[PDB]
Design a protein around this ligand. Structure first.
Ligand SMILES: *[C@@H]1O[C@H](CO)[C@@H](O[C@@H]2O[C@H](CO)[C@@H](O)[C@H](O)[C@H]2NC(C)=O)[C@H](O)[C@H]1NC(C)=O
Ligand SMILES: *[C@@H]1O[C@H](CO)[C@@H](O[C@@H]2O[C@H](CO)[C@@H](O)[C@H](O)[C@H]2NC(C)=O)[C@H](O)[C@H]1NC(C)=O
Ligand SMILES: *[C@@H]1O[C@H](CO)[C@@H](O)[C@H](O)[C@H]1NC(C)=O
Ligand SMILES: *[C@@H]1O[C@H](CO)[C@@H](O)[C@H](O)[C@H]1NC(C)=O
Ligand SMILES: *[C@@H]1O[C@H](CO)[C@@H](O)[C@H](O)[C@H]1NC(C)=O
Ligand SMILES: *[C@@H]1O[C@H](CO)[C@@H](O)[C@H](O)[C@H]1NC(C)=O
Ligand SMILES: *[C@@H]1O[C@H](CO)[C@@H](O)[C@H](O)[C@H]1NC(C)=O
Ligand SMILES: *[C@@H]1O[C@H](CO)[C@@H](O)[C@H](O)[C@H]1NC(C)=O
Ligand SMILES: *[C@@H]1O[C@H](CO)[C@@H](O)[C@H](O)[C@H]1NC(C)=O
Ligand SMILES: *[C@@H]1O[C@H](CO)[C@@H](O)[C@H](O)[C@H]1NC(C)=O
Ligand SMILES: *[C@@H]1O[C@H](CO)[C@@H](O)[C@H](O)[C@H]1NC(C)=O
Lengths: 309, 329, 180, 176
């Protein structure tokens, strides 16, 4: 299951966008009120909400847990999801495959507060707590327990006694290993798997390209360049043309900001859903039908991804 | 807390501590700290030659009597141990136009839109050290002088001078109406977040503010390789010329009238350009210029001019009234 | 011709401002200018030397300010966004900046991070919880003498669970908590 | 924003009328009208966007009330951090405050475990507990509170013989 968690943070400056390096245009913008300050406020609110979403989704553990020297887990391999200490950035192979499949005038893109490695460390700590302690570390101190006993507890939560797991351990382990192996091939072979994550980036890029493209529009004026209009004719007609251009660019900015607000609200809803799914499927076993997967639920493991989980 | 933008004296600026003629740069700040009353007032104007009314602001006995007049005494001054008079700095007097009657004497003088605003404040401090603290200046009086003043002096028989700049300030109004504190919006990074937040208290955190831009410095101009040139050696250094009746009409081009070579090769005694300035001739180049070959007498060249008459003007070569060209002999 | 510096250029009547650097784009012999995907003139050719010359925009960004609170102290730190510390420092030693207050304190102590150039704090090798977020994992705090310091955020303590094939832990006491 | 000229002569209605001809006053009033209409539209759009979020929060609050106050919820980290017990609502201006009562264990203690027990050639499994040992003797206890008990027939159930269990132990299971 794949879910977006956040989007890129942007900041826009009014003067460098509209009245580019013109002292005759800055004065004519003061008479239009306080649009710029409230636009900046809205953008800053979106920016801080972006980091709040990630912190809410991922930062759910007080302490960072680390797996012991990897040993026999009853037959389960887990090598494709645990971090590999043999390459930079300390990722997992599936994470590496995920990362390798995802590819101005007055605008600015701000970096996220949390780097990718911190997200990887959160994911590793969550996985270690899940596989060494079980569901107990989500409600207090973590308690150690062997993995087969943990799954014996898991079967007991769906109406199946403990006999089945203990008398069929090897077969279940082999089935789990085969499923894990086939997951990587299924993800790699299918090209249109990470679609929704790419859609967010494509939408943001299209919005930015449209915003920078309309800067060349004449908007029913003499031209689309301030210098030529200024040094060609009388002050009054220059004022009229500058007012026309200012109105057009303000309309464009308003449209962009409203679109960004709507998309941010949608992503906020998605992030809340993702946080709930994490807390209810990873830190415990859920009885809700078709919530943590198709069929009776056993476990769940998270993996980091660009702008999503 | 009101945010306003006007001309003010910047905080922590440079102040000169002391009859020189101090320039009047869009208002000045004056603070006199004396009790002997040596500083009897100020003079304002540009030339003091009966053209601009010398603003004689004199505080003679009790309250300042703003008399807009000019009072030539005799000329030669000297030290005196009554009159207390005889300042002959100026020469000419004229008629009177306006008349008005009514330590740390600090005054602010401003002029805008033909109105002279004088703000005064008199706190009877006992001391000579520069006093720290806040003191607001009230609009004592305004005057519709409607003139221009660029220079001012002080009337003698201990004072500081400052100049004002446009700036944005933050002011605090008391629950009376009194101004108790002010904050600048240019000095320090802190007194910019204070202006942005519109408050005197800032909490812990990171605050967005204005943006920075690296302005340009030099101005490079790179026009294309210059390759073509005006053919003139064949004209202005020829072998033979023609008679007046069989004049040539040589066609020239690639001509920016860029003739500096002729200045050095031929020391032109006569050079008359009846159109645009010869120096500006390099600004625009031409296409269909024609030139003529003449060999004429001495007392005949003056006849080659617009609107002239004579044998040569009437029978050989005639110039138009709107003749745009240069004659060289 | 001046390269790698901010100048005003006029090429065959085309005027603008920026930094002219060497490029590798290959024009065709009948082409003069170059344009980006939307409107900007990204490239230009020298009329004399016939060299491709990348016009690159001037550096700009935010001037966000870090403060610990007026009640506590009065010191501040300034963060220049999206610019390296060689420039800005150069543009201070030679002026041509927009913010007129210019020099804050200089006094060395300039740190360079992925968010931008940080002036007014010293980087330390310690690590603990974040107080004032700044950029990519870099936070700031006020400690003592007293000054503003920047460090690398810590995600918390490291705890290793003594996993074993036959080891279990059972609680013997509980606690009742109330949250809001 | 009532004082913004929006590129007009002035921001006061009466002065514009009684200073010049009605024709140009028409254009100026039209400009002011358009500016103020845009301001109102922006205000209404912002209000609608905020109202949507507040509606979502209200729905979440109603669900939390119905599931934590009127009953006990099994969802993890929904009605508090830990094992949920109770909840109490308190009124507040334009909001509600919840007091969540939870259960948190402490004072851990290790020991040695074993999935099953072989007594008479037949594997045994606990009915509701977990097998533990304190080094010398084996007991069965709860899963969230230490309470050892002796192993007995009505405490465990038998399933199969002892040939598939990995960590099986050879202690004694008593019978009444
Ligand atoms: C867990 O899976 C990994 C990869 O699926 C196993 O590593 C492979 O081991 C075989 C040994 O037969 C090698 O031929 C492969 O080259 C290994 N893969 C890689 C990518 O190096 C690993 O052995 C499995 N774990 C256990 C305990 O068997
Ligand atoms: C005008 O034309 C004459 C004839 O070509 C030039 O005369 C020559 O000047 C050079 C100067 O070094 C002498 O060496 C030659 O001997 C001169 N003439 C001959 C016989 O070749 C004259 O210099 C030209 N000057 C201008 C004003 O262009
Ligand atoms: C206003 O000023 C009077 C003195 O003129 C003073 O008694 C009073 O307390 C002041 N109150 C305010 C600050 O409103
Ligand atoms: C044109 O280029 C040639 C060769 O570099 C040079 O000698 C000449 O001076 C140039 N002309 C100009 C720059 O006008
Ligand atoms: C003038 O025109 C005649 C035409 O035959 C030509 O021979 C002569 O060289 C020309 N000279 C000048 C001064 O233009
Ligand atoms: C440092 O600043 C220079 C500015 O000339 C820039 O080119 C460079 O990318 C920046 N970073 C490094 C690591 O040099
Ligand atoms: C008991 O379990 C805890 C789990 O953190 C471990 O730290 C401790 O060393 C263990 N004691 C033993 C195995 O005696
Ligand atoms: C599992 O733990 C037991 C301790 O009783 C140990 O003897 C055995 O080697 C372990 N299995 C491994 C390390 O694969
Ligand atoms: C359990 O905790 C309580 C209070 O936290 C304490 O009074 C008591 O001694 C502890 N031990 C037992 C066995 O109750
Ligand atoms: C273990 O439990 C038994 C049960 O009676 C007790 O007698 C003994 O002292 C405990 N401790 C050890 C080390 O056996
Ligand atoms: C447990 O008991 C059975 C039957 O007496 C015996 O075959 C087996 O070897 C015993 N296991 C151990 C570890 O002694």
């Amino acid at each position: 299951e794949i879910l977006p968690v956040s989007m890129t943070k942007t900041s826009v400056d009014c003067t460098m966008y509209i009245c580019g390096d013109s002292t005759e245009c800055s004065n004519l913008l003061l008479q239009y009120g306080s649009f710029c300050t409230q636009l900046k406020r809205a953008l800053t609110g979106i920016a801080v909400e972006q980091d709040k979403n990630t912190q809410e989704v991922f930062a759910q553990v007080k302490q960072i847990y680390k797996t012991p020297p990897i040993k026999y887990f009853g037959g389960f391999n887990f090598s494709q999801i645990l971090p590999d200490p043999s390459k930079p950035s300390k990722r997992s192979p599936i994470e590496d495959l995920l990362f390798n499949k995802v590819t101005f005038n007055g605008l600015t893109v701000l970096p996220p507060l949390l780097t990718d490695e911190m997200i990887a460390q959160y994911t590793s700590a969550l996985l270690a707590g899940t596989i060494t302690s079980g569901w107990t570390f989500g409600a207090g101190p973590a308690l150690q327990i062997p993995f087969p006993m943990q799954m014996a507890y898991r079967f007991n939560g769906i109406g199946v006694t403990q006999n089945v797991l203990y008398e069929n351990q090897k077969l279940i382990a082999n089935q789990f290993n085969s499923a894990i192996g086939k997951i990587q091939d299924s993800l790699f072979s299918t090209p249109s798997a990470l679609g929704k994550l790419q859609d967010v980036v494509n939408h943001n890029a299209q919005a930015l390209n449209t915003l920078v493209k309309q800067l060349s529009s004449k908007f029913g004026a003499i031209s689309s360049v301030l210098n030529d209009i200024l040094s060609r004719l009388d002050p009054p007609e220059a004022e009229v043309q500058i007012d026309r251009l200012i109105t057009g660019r303000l309309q464009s900015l308003q449209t962009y900001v409203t679109q960004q607000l709507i998309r941010a609200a949608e992503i906020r809803a998605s992030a809340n859903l993702a946080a709930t799914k994490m807390s209810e499927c990873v830190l415990g076993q859920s009885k809700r039908v078709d919530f943590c997967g198709k069929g009776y639920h056993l476990m769940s493991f998270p993996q980091s991804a660009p702008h999503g989980v | 807390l009101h945010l306003t933008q006007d001309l003010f004296l910047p905080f922590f600026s440079n102040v000169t501590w002391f009859n020189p003629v101090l320039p009047f740069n869009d208002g000045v700040y004056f603070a006199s700290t004396e009790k002997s009353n040596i500083i009897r007032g100020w003079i304002f104007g540009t030339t003091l030659d009966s053209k601009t009314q010398s603003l004689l602001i004199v505080n003679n006995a009790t309250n300042v009597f703003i008399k807009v007049c000019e009072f030539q005494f005799c000329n030669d001054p000297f030290l005196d141990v009554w009159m207390e008079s005889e300042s002959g700095v100026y020469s000419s007097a004229n008629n009177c136009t306006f008349e008005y009657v009514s330590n740390l004497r600090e005054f602010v003088f401003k002029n805008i839109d033909g109105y002279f605003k004088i703000y005064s404040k008199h706190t009877p401090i006992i001391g000579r050290d520069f006093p720290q603290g806040f003191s607001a200046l009230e609009p004592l009086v305004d005057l519709p002088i409607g003139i221009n003043i660029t220079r001012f002096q002080t009337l003698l028989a201990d004072y500081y001078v400052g100049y004002l700049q446009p700036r944005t300030f933050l002011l605090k109004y008391n629950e009376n109406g009194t101004i108790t504190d002010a904050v600048d919006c240019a000095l320090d990074p802190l007194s910019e977040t204070k202006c942005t937040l519109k408050s005197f208290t800032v909490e812990k955190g990171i605050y967005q503010t204005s943006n920075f831009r690296v302005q340009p410095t030099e101005s490079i101009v790179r026009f294309p390789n210059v390759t073509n040139l005006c053919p003139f050696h064949e004209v202005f250094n020829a072998t033979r010329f023609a008679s007046v009746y069989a004049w040539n009409r040589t066609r020239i081009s690639n001509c920016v009238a860029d003739y500096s070579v002729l200045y050095n090769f031929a020391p032109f005694f006569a050079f008359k350009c009846y159109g645009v300035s010869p120096t500006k001739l390099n600004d625009l180049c031409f296409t269909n210029v024609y030139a003529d070959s003449f060999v004429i007498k001495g007392n005949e060249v003056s006849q080659i001019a617009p609107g002239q008459t004579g044998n040569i003007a009437d029978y050989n070569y005639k110039l138009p009234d709107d003749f745009t060209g240069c004659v060289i002999a | 011709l001046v390269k790698n510096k901010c100048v005003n250029f006029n090429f065959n009547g085309l005027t603008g401002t920026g930094v002219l650097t060497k490029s590798n784009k290959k024009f065709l012999p009948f082409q003069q200018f170059g344009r980006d995907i939307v409107d900007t003139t990204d490239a230009v050719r020298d009329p004399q030397t016939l060299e491709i010359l990348d016009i690159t925009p001037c550096s700009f960004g935010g001037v966000s300010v870090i403060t610990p609170g007026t009640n506590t102290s009065n010191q501040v730190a300034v963060l220049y966004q999206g610019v390296n510390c060689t420039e800005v420092s150069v543009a201070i030693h030679a002026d041509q900046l927009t913010p007129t207050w210019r020099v804050y304190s200089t006094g060395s102590n300039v740190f360079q991070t992925r968010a931008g150039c940080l002036i007014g704090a010293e980087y330390v090798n310690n690590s603990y919880e974040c107080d004032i977020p700044i950029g990519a994992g870099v936070c700031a705090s006020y400690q003592t003498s007293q000054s503003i310091i920047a460090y690398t955020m810590s995600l918390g303590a490291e705890n290793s669970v003594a996993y074993s094939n036959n080891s279990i832990a059972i609680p013997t006491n509980f606690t009742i908590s109330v949250t809001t | 924003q009532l004082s913004s000229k929006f590129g007009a002569i002035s921001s006061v209605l009466n002065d514009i009328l009684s200073r010049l001809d009605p024709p140009e006053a028409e254009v100026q009033i039209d400009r002011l009208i358009t500016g103020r209409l845009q301001s109102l539209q922006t205000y209404v759009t912002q209000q609608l966007i905020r109202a949507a979020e507040i509606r979502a929060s209200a729905n979440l609050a109603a669900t939390k009330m119905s599931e934590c106050v009127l009953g006990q919820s099994k969802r993890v980290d929904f009605c508090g951090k830990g094992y949920h017990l109770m909840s109490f609502p308190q009124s507040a201006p334009h909001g509600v405050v919840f007091l969540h009562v939870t259960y948190v264990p402490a004072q851990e203690k290790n020991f040695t475990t074993a999935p099953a027990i072989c007594h008479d050639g037949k594997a045994h499994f606990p009915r509701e507990g977990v097998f533990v040992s304190n080094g010398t003797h084996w007991f069965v206890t709860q899963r969230n509170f230490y309470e050892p008990q002796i192993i007995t027939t009505d405490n465990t159930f038998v399933s199969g013989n002892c040939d598939v269990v990995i960590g099986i132990v050879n202690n004694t299971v008593y019978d009444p």
